[PDB]
């Protein structure tokens, strides 16, 4: 992963989806979020998960620079994830403010 986001540290405020997450022709998922915080620049926590209690990462994050570079509120960013097959969950953010969206990918 890029050091750029790591040195920013993780974004702490709440994210919100801006539109329904959309499948690509490759079966990956593109999901856009809006960030409520003013602590940018910061790194967007973004993963797929099947177990909401362990939050063990499944699939992978494709986005090369998953960051919010603006310090003004309500900035948007697009994440792209490679989901596992079957049912899973998009998980954006960390802690009590994280948001989730169910996802299903066929061809297990």
């Amino acid at each position: 992963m890029r050091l750029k986001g790591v040195s920013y540290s993780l974004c702490t405020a709440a994210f919100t989806f801006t539109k329904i997450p959309a499948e690509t022709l490759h079966g990956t998922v593109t999901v856009e979020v809006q960030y409520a915080g003013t602590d940018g620049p910061c790194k967007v926590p973004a993963q797929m998960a099947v177990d909401m209690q362990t939050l063990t990462p499944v699939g992978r994050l494709i986005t090369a620079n998953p960051v919010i570079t603006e310090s003004t509120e309500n900035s948007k960013m697009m994440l792209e994830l490679d989901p596992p097959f079957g049912d899973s969950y998009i998980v954006i953010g960390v802690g009590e403010k994280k948001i989730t969206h169910h996802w299903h990918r066929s061809g297990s």
Partner: antibody
Amino acid sequence: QVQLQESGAELMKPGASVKLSCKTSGYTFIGYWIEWLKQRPGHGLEWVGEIFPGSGRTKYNEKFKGRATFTADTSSNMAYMQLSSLTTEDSAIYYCARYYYGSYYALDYWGQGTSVTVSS
Amino acid sequence: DIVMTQSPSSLSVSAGEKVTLSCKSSQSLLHSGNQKNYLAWYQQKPGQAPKLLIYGASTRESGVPDRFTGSGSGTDFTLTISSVQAEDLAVYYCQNDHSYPLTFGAGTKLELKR
């Protein structure tokens, strides 16, 4: 709010080269593509090409014969289109627009356009 | 390249009418992996940049009024305005979003009947 602010109107001589800019706000500049479009009266919209400023990757419509070059300054959230060997047929409004290749979200936010007039 | 054909180029309308705009592509805009048609519709008023209305052939961009409906698949697409209003008077473009180079139709202009 997502905004793309383009540079002011240009008056160029034939054979010259123009540098247009597009400064963005409201989103992570290095996370999306900038697409460049050409609109002149009598024609619809024509795609010039694209740059992904976070990487430098660029793609061009062959019809421009290599006369366009896209660059970016990520510290300014600015994308540039240079169009060289201008002719009167390059007189047009040029737009930049935000894009995410791989998605089908299409061209969702557009700059206000820069007018270019090419005349001797 | 993919050619986008809009016909007719102009259409005279009255407030409250149902209007259907046509758009045809030279080859299919369908990607079989996600079974989505990569077709977008834009609205342009004079002195303004185009505005995105519909992406993926049928999905309305946030904030676009519900009276705009995109439909169709493969090579034949339509934009329907169920009850046209005065603010809908504009030029409408469809766009090949399927593969490069991106290409656009020549547009259909809505004008007012009298």
